[PDB]
Amino acid sequence: ASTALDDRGEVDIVADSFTVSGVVANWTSWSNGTNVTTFDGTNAPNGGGLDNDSGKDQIRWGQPASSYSSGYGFIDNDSALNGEFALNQDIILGTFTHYNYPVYSGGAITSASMDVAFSVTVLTPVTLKLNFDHNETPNTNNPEASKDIIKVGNTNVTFENAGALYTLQVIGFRIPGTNQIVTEIRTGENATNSYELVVRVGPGEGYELPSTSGNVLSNDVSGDVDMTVVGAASGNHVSSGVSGSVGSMIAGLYGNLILLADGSYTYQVTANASSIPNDAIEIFTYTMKDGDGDTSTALLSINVNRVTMADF
């Protein structure tokens, strides 16, 4: 005597682009180094390679006990960015390298901060702070304990554009090519570590993945009889009906879904907007159950729309 009906939802994701200058990195502050130097990167052995600015994107410290000084490097990704900052898209701002060499104990900073500056085309200069805690660990015969830990922070900066707020936001580090985003790196002594530095920029005062909410059991029909979600799954699976995964994170094509037993769902567009086709729709299947115990399966279809910055 009960039938679950089909649910319709929709979420907007901004798929526009910002015109940006090249970016310039300067290591501006730190604590506790011995012999601390910041400098524009050089093709010298421990110089971090080159970039196209006069900014100091290299920073070392320490008194070499074997050869080179430990430190950080940041080499902007300007050549590939082509003066452009897509919105709601992973952006490789540059490649961060960790130069971990053996330095006499006590020689390392404990923290450091890096500015990244650019303009937004009229030309709005904006700066993004990047924070780093550093742990030059005491080196022992345990090479995994003798490793160095960097931790980066999810800082942001909010800036105005066409009378509207946007927010750039650190996501994290990424082993190039792997999709894995971390916030702490571990580098062996006498070794380096290069990571893409992933950022994203969206509308608003902080960066929040696009997202939409609702209740599936609201249009469902049951004699009074109380209803309960007992299954959810990605795709169309009505023929089968679904069991399990209530209140689990359920990955679709473009984003993840969570459906609670009382019908409450939230859906988060996580995908890069380069992966969101026009007329895109995310499909989930739920199965409801009335108090009598009678099952019933329906669909939850959410349009994922691509809107311009002007749109709203």
Partner: peptide, 4 residues
């Protein structure tokens, strides 16, 4: 001496 000790290293880090």
């Amino acid at each position: 001496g000790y290293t880090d």
